[PDB]
Amino acid sequence: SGPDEAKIKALLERTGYTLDVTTGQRKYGGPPPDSVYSGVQPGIGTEVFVGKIPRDLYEDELVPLFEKAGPIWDLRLMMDPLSGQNRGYAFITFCGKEAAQEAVKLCDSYEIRPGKHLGVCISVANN
């Protein structure tokens, strides 16, 4: 297990996004390169929750899929600091509401690995 360093490296060389690893989290972009998006942090309705991510799957797989909805502002893959695998979920901020809704339409139930379907929804606050 663990992310494939070569695959991650080629991803960042292709897209130019930053990738910052902290305890419990991998943050892709946030902000993206301003060539992708200049502007204030995207607001309400622009973030999706992505669940049921296979625990050994990392950004080299997630980013090309969700880029099909639109340009990514940030991707935060939550990590288990004890196992060094991801926690099974991530938050993805897009640059607009329309792209976030497109991520739900395209990627909710997407079979990213055999037998493993993602759950995707607009991330909203509780009450």
Swiss-Prot record:
It comes from the Eukaryota. There is a cross-link at K52 (Glycyl lysine isopeptide (Lys-Gly) (interchain with G-Cter in SUMO2)). Residues 46-125 form the RRM domain. It is found in: Nucleus; Microsome; Nucleus, Nucleoplasm; Cytoplasm. It is linked to Neurodevelopmental disorder with dysmorphic facies and skeletal and brain abnormalities: An autosomal dominant disorder characterized by global developmental delay with impaired intellectual development and poor or absent speech, corpus callosum structural defects and cerebellar hypoplasia on brain imaging, poor overall growth, facial dysmorphism, and skeletal defects. Variable additional findings include hypotonia, seizures, and ocular defects. Component of ribonucleosomes, which are complexes of at least 20 other different heterogeneous nuclear ribonucleoproteins (hnRNP). hnRNP play an important role in processing of precursor mRNA in the nucleus. Identified in the spliceosome C complex. Identified in a IGF2BP1-dependent mRNP granule complex containing untranslated mRNAs. Interacts with GTPBP1. This is Heterogeneous nuclear ribonucleoprotein R. The lineage of its organism: Eukaryota, Metazoa, Chordata, Craniata, Vertebrata.
